[PDB]
Amino acid sequence: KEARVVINDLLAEQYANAFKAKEEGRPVGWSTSVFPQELAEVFDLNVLYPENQAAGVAAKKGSLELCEIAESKGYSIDLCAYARTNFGLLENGGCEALDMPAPDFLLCCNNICNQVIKWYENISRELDIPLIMIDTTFNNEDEVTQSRIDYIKAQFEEAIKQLEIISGKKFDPKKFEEVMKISAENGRLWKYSMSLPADSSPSPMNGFDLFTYMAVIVCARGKKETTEAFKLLIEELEDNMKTGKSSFRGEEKYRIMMEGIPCWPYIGYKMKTLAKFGVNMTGSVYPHAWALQYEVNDLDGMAVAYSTMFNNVNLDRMTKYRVDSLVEGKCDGAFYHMNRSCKLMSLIQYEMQRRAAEETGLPYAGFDGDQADPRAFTNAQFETRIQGLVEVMEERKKL
Amino acid sequence: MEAILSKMKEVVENPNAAVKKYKSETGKKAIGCFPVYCPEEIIHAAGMLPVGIWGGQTELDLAKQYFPAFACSIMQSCLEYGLKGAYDELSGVIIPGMCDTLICLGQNWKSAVPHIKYISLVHPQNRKLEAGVKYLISEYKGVKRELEEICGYEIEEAKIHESIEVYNEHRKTMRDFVEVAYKHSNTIKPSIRSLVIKSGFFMRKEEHTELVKDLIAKLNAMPEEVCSGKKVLLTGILADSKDILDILEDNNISVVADDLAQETRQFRTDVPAGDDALERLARQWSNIEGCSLAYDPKKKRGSLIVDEVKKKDIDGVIFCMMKFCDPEEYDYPLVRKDIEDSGIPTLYVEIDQQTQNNEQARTRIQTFAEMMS
Ligand code: SF4
Ligand code: SF4
Ligand SMILES: [S]
C-alpha cells in the first residue's frame, strides 16, 4: 500500500463527496487555507478550498485562461492570481482540469492575508450566500493580546450560530471534542513528517514534495483518514532515512531554504533545474503553518493557535522563523521567491532577507515569479539566479 | 473668499511650516494620521494636532530598499517622505493596519524611521458584533496609553467627550459645504472644492470649522447657479493632484459630490452618542458604510453612489483608481456594474503619484465629456 496513492485518492475523494452533497441538496462551503476547519467538521459539512483548486489547475497549465476571463470582467492583473483564477472559474461555470461545485456558504479567515476578505466579499455578494468571518487581527505585540483572544472566541460563537442555521443541526459538544483530538494529532504528524529533512543528511525527500502533501493538511485536517495517510507517509520517509534513499535524485551537494510558494505552472522545470545543480530544500517554515496545537476543549488556546500563524505575527517573529529554519536545516544558502501575487510576503522581503543574512552569515539570491500566473515567471532567469547562488556556496565550501 | 482660500492654501502648500508654528505657539506636540481612518478625537483631546498623511507627488529612491515596485503609489510616497525626514517634526504616527500594504509599512517603519514612534491600530472586520465593538475599545485604550507616554500627561475622559462634540460639529459643517458648493458649481471649481476639504488635515478642526462657516455664509449670499457644464461624482482613495483637477475644469466639468477616502468618507458618518467616550468612537466604525476598507458582504458602495448621483442630477461617475490598490481593484467590477445598471456612465482613470505625464487621463476625460454630449 503506497502512500502517494492513498494521498491522491483521498484528495480526489473530497471533490467527489462535495459534488455528491450538491446533487442531494446538502450545503457545500468554500474556505480559506488556514480557517478553523474544526467548526464546520462538527456538522459533517463538505468544505472545499479555492486556493488548493487554483494551485491544482495552475499545475495543469489551466490557470492562465481563467485569469484572462477574470481580467476581461475588469479585475486588475495586480490582484492575487488565486483570486483571479477563482473569479474566472465562477464566470466559466467551472473548468475542465480540476472542477468543483459552486458554494452555498463561505468561510474566511485573514490570518494568511487581508486580500481574502475582499475576494470573499465579492463571492458573497455575487452569489448571495452567507459569509462567515473569523477576523484574526495582525499581532504587532510579541504576544496575542487578551482582547484578540476574547474577540476570536466571540467569533467562534457567531460562526457556530450561523452554521447551525446552514446545516439544520445543533452544535454537538461531544462530537466537537472528538474533532479537536483528531485535528491535534494530524497537526503533530504534519509538523513531524515535514521536519524530517532538517536532521537528516541527505534528506529522505525532494523538498518540493512538501507542497503536494500540503494539500492534505489544508483540506482534511480534521479527518481520521488523514491520520492514516500521514502515518503511512512517515513509514516510507523513515525507511528512506535508514537506507540512505530519497525521492531527490543525485548527490545532495547544497542544502537551502526557499522562501515562498512554488510557481505552479513551472513546478516541473524548477525541480529539474535545482536537481541538476545538486540543490535540495531541507529547511522550511511550512511545517509550522498547520501544526496548530491546543488542548482539548481549550478555546483560548485554539484562538491563539490560529492567531499566531506566521503570516500574522510581527516582523521580528517572521524573521526568527526564517533564521531558525536555515540554522536547524543545516542550510548553505537561502533562495527568495518575490511572488507578484502575495503582497504581504513581498513587501517585507527586503528587510527580512537582510536580517536573516546578517544573523546566519549565509549567502542568498532570488527571482521573480507568481504561484499561479505564468506570465510573471521567466525560466532563463530562474536558471541563472540559482547558478549564481551555487557558485557562491561552492567557493565557501573550500577550507 | 480670498482671505479664507489663501489661508487654506498656505497650510496645504506648506504643511511643515504649519506644524512648526503649532508646536511653538501652544508648546504642544503633533501626531501623524495615516489613511484611511484614525481616532483623531483622542489626539485632539490631549491638546495635540492631528495631521493627515496622504503621500504626495514624489519620485522613489530610498523607498526601494523596503518595497518592490508593486506597492500602491500613495504608500510608496509616504515611505519615501518618511525616509527623507519630511515627517521629523511629528512625535509619532498612527498607521492603521487596514490592508496588507498598510500592515507591511508599519512593520518596516519600526526600522526605517526609528525616531518616530509607530502606534499600532487594527480595526475589526466584524464591526457590527458587540464583541467587535468591545475589541476596538481595547485597541483605542492602547492608542490612548501610547499617546499619554508621548505627551507626558493623562488624557481625561471629559476632554475626549468635548473633542467628539467638536468633531461632529465639523462633520456637519463640511456636509453643509457640500450642499452649498453643489448650488454654486460654477464658482466652486474642482480645484476649489478640493482645497476647502483637504485644508482640514493641517489645522485644528474647530479652527477649520469657523473658516468653512465663514465661506458658507459668503456663498449663500451669492445667488444659486445653474451649472454651465457637466457634473460628476469622484470615487476612490484620492484625487488632489493639481494636474487632474486642471483637466476636469478644462473640459467644463464640476465636481459636486464624492466618495473619496480623503474627502467625504471622513465626514459622512457621525460619532454616536453615549456615556463612554472610547465606546462612542468604536461605534462610529460600526456605522461606516460604502467604503472599500469597511467590511460589507452586501457591498452597498454601488447603491449608495447611485443615490447621491440622483439626488444631484449628476451626469457621470469617475473611478479615480489608485495605482496598485488591491481593495479598490476588488471593488471595481461590482461597483461599476451597480452604477451602470442604473443608466449612469462611468470612467476609469489611473492615479499615480510618481508620474510627470497625465496624458491618458487628459484624453480619457476629454472623450468622457464629449461622450456626455
Ligand atoms: S497567495 Fe498571498 S495574497 Fe494570495 S491568497 Fe495566499 S496569502 Fe493571500
Ligand atoms: S487601501 Fe489601497 S491605497 Fe490605501 S494603503 Fe491599502 S492598497 Fe494602498
Ligand atoms: S490608503
Three-class SS of chain A: CCHHHHHHHHHHHHHHHHHHHHHHCCCEEEECCCCCCHHHHCCCCEEECHHHHHHHHHHCCCHHHHHHHHHHCCCCCCCCHHHHHHHHHHHHCCCCCCCCCCCCEEEEECCCCCHHHHHHHHHHHHHCCCEEEECCCCECCCCCCHHHHHHHHHHHHHHHHHHHHHHCCCCCHHHHHHHHHHHHHHHHHHHHHCCCCCCCCCCCCCHHHHHHHHHHHHHCCCCHHHHHHHHHHHHHHHHHHHHCCCCCCCCCCEEEEEECCCCHHHHHHHHHHHHHCCEEEEECCHHHCCCCCCCCCCHHHHHHHHHCCHHHECHHHHHHHHHHHHHHCCCCEEEEEEECCCHHHHCCHHHHHHHHHHHHCCCEEEEEECCCCHHHCCHHHHHHHHHHHHHHHHHHHCC
Beta bridge partners of A279: A254
For residue B238, the CA-to-ligand 3 centroid distance in Å is 9
The rounded distance, in Å, linking the Cα atoms of B306 and B342 is 7
Query: How many CB pairs below 8 Å do chains A and B form together?
Result: 137
CB neighbours of A305 closer than 8 A, spacing ≥ 6?
A292, A293, A294
| Element holding B91 (H helix, E strand) | none
Report the residue of B75, B100, B122, B300 to disrupt the A interface, i.e. the one with the largest count of A CBs within 10 Å: B100
The rounded distance, in Å, linking the Cα atoms of A251 and A253 is 6
The beta-carbon neighbor of B329 closest among A78, A121, A154 is: A78
The rounded distance, in Å, linking the Cα atoms of A10 and A224 is 11
Q: Do the beta carbons of residue A101 and residue A28 sit within 8 Å?
A: yes
The rounded distance, in Å, linking the Cα atoms of B176 and A378 is 56
For residue B101, the CA-to-ligand 2 centroid distance in Å is 6
Q: Give the C-alpha distances (Å, rounded to integers) separating A308 from A199, A317, B271.
A: 25, 10, 33
Question: Going by DSSP bridges, is the β-strand pair B316-322/B230-236 parallel, antiparallel, or unpaired?
Answer: parallel
Is the Cα torsion angle A226, A232, A238, A240 positive or negative in sign?
Answer: negative
DSSP conformation class of B372: T
DSSP conformation class of B3: H
Place of cell 502512500: A3
Q: Which ligand is nearest to the CA of A83?
A: 1
Q: Do the beta carbons of residue A48 and residue A32 sit within 8 Å?
A: no
Q: Do the beta carbons of residue A47 and residue A107 sit within 8 Å?
A: yes
Q: Which fold has domain B230-373?
A: Rossmann fold (3.40.50)
Spell out which residues of chain A touch residue B101, defining contact as CB-CB under 8 Å: 343, 347
Exposure string for A128-156, b = 16+ CB within 10 A, e = fewer = ebbbbbbbbbbbbeeebbebbbbbbebbb
When computed from its CA atoms, the radius of gyration of chain B, rounded to whole angstroms, is 20
Closest CA to A294 of A371, A179, A148, A192: A179
DSSP conformation class of B273: P
**Closest atom of ligand 2 relative to the B326 alpha carbon:** 7
Put simply, the chain A residues between 356 and 375 with a CB less than 8 A from any chain B CB are none
The rounded distance, in Å, linking the Cα atoms of B80 and A191 is 41
Q: Reduce the secondary structure of A14-48 to three states and give it as a string.
A: HHHHHHHHHHHCCCEEEECCCCCCHHHHCCCCEEE
The rounded distance, in Å, linking the Cα atoms of B278 and B82 is 30
What SS3 state is found at B51? strand
The beta-carbon neighbor of B297 closest among A131, A147, A343 is: A131
Exposure string for A178-213, b = 16+ CB within 10 A, e = fewer = bbbebbbebbebbbebbbbbbebebbbbbbbbbbeb
Q: Do the beta carbons of residue B70 and residue B324 sit within 8 Å?
A: yes
Q: Do the beta carbons of residue B130 and residue B140 sit within 8 Å?
A: no
Q: Do the beta carbons of residue B280 and residue B164 sit within 8 Å?
A: yes
Q: What order do you get walking across the sheet with B93-96 strand by strand?
A: B49-52, B30-33, B93-96, B118-121
**CATH class of residue range B1-27+154-229:** mainly alpha
The Cα of A311 is separated from the nearest Cα of chain B by a number of Å equal to 11
Q: What order do you get walking across the sheet with A131-134 strand by strand?
A: A46-48, A28-31, A105-109, A131-134
Q: How many CB atoms lie within 10 A of CB B70?
A: 17
Q: Do the beta carbons of residue A105 and residue A29 sit within 8 Å?
A: yes
Beta bridge partners of B236: B260, B320
What SS3 state is found at B318? strand
The rounded distance, in Å, linking the Cα atoms of B202 and B213 is 17
The rounded distance, in Å, linking the Cα atoms of B227 and A28 is 54
Q: Please report the resolution in angstroms.
A: 1.8
Place of cell 492513498: A6
Give the long-range contacts of residues A209-212, CB within 8 A, separation 24 or more.
Answer: A209/A247, A210/A281, A210/A284, A210/A286, A210/A287, A211/A261, A211/A262, A211/A286, A212/A7
Closest CA to B275 of B124, B135, B161, B154: B161
Place of cell 507616554: B149
Q: Does B291 belong to an annotated binding site? A: no
Instruction: Please give the method by which this entry was determined.
Output: X-ray
Does ligand 2 lie within 6 Å of residue B322's CB atom?
A: yes
Atom 1, ligand 3: which residue's CA is nearest?
A: B35
The rounded distance, in Å, linking the Cα atoms of B252 and B265 is 25
Give the long-range contacts of residues B307-313, CB within 8 A, separation 24 or more.
Answer: B308/B233, B308/B257, B308/B259, B309/B233, B309/B257, B309/B339, B309/B342, B309/B344, B311/B257, B312/B182, B312/B231, B312/B256, B312/B257, B313/B231
The rounded distance, in Å, linking the Cα atoms of A217 and A223 is 9
The rounded distance, in Å, linking the Cα atoms of A135 and B144 is 23
CB-based contact, A73 to chain B, within 8 Å:
yes
Spell out which residues of chain A touch residue B126, defining contact as CB-CB under 8 Å: 133, 135, 151, 155, 158
The rounded distance, in Å, linking the Cα atoms of A288 and A245 is 25
Closest CA to A365 of A394, A390, A347, A330: A390
Cβ of B97 within 8 Å of Cβ of A74? The answer is no
Report the first-to-last Cα separation within chain A, whole angstroms: 46
Q: How many CB atoms lie within 10 A of CB A327?
A: 15
Q: How many CB atoms lie within 10 A of CB A381?
A: 12
> Which overall architecture, per CATH, does domain B28-153 show?
3-Layer(aba) Sandwich (3.40)
Exposure string for B293-303, b = 16+ CB within 10 A, e = fewer = bbbbbebbbbe
Closest CA to A355 of B61, B318, B66, B249: B66
Positions of CATH 3.40.50.11900 in chain B: 230-373
Q: Give the C-alpha distances (Å, rounded to integers) separating A200 from A205, A271, B314.
A: 10, 20, 69
Report the first-to-last Cα separation within chain B, whole angstroms: 33
Q: Does A51 belong to an annotated binding site? A: yes
Positions of CATH 3.40.50.11890 in chain B: 28-153
Q: Do the beta carbons of residue B211 and residue B234 sit within 8 Å?
A: no
Q: Give the C-alpha distances (Å, rounded to integers) separating A42 from A27, A106, B181.
A: 14, 16, 57
Give B40: exposed, middle or buried? Use CB within 10 Å, 0-12, 13-18, 19+.
Answer: buried
Give B24: exposed, middle or buried? Use CB within 10 Å, 0-12, 13-18, 19+.
Answer: exposed
CB-based contact, A34 to chain B, within 8 Å:
no
Concatenated DSSP letters for B156-201?
A: -HHHHHHHHHHHHHHHHHHHHHHHHHHTSTTTS-HHHHHHHHHGGG
Q: How many CB atoms lie within 10 A of CB A261?
A: 21
Q: How many CB atoms lie within 10 A of CB A291?
A: 19
The Cα of B64 is separated from the nearest Cα of chain A by a number of Å equal to 9
Pocket of ligand 3 (CB under 6 A): B 35-36, 74, 237
Closest CA to A371 of A194, A112, A197, A102: A112
CB neighbours of B205 closer than 8 A, spacing ≥ 6?
B40, B44, B166, B167, B170
CB neighbours of B170 closer than 8 A, spacing ≥ 6?
B200, B205, B206, B208, B209, B267
Spell out which residues of chain B touch residue A151, defining contact as CB-CB under 8 Å: 124, 126, 131-132, 134-135
Positions of CATH 1.20.1270.370 in chain B: 1-27+154-229
Beta bridge partners of B346: B317
Q: Does B33 belong to an annotated binding site? A: no
Give me A302's grid cell: 485554539
Q: Do the beta carbons of residue A111 and residue A85 sit within 8 Å?
A: no
Closest CA to A131 of B258, B45, B299: B299
Give me B46's grid cell: 490631549
Phi/psi for A233 (5° steps) reads -65, -40
CB-based contact, A243 to chain B, within 8 Å:
no
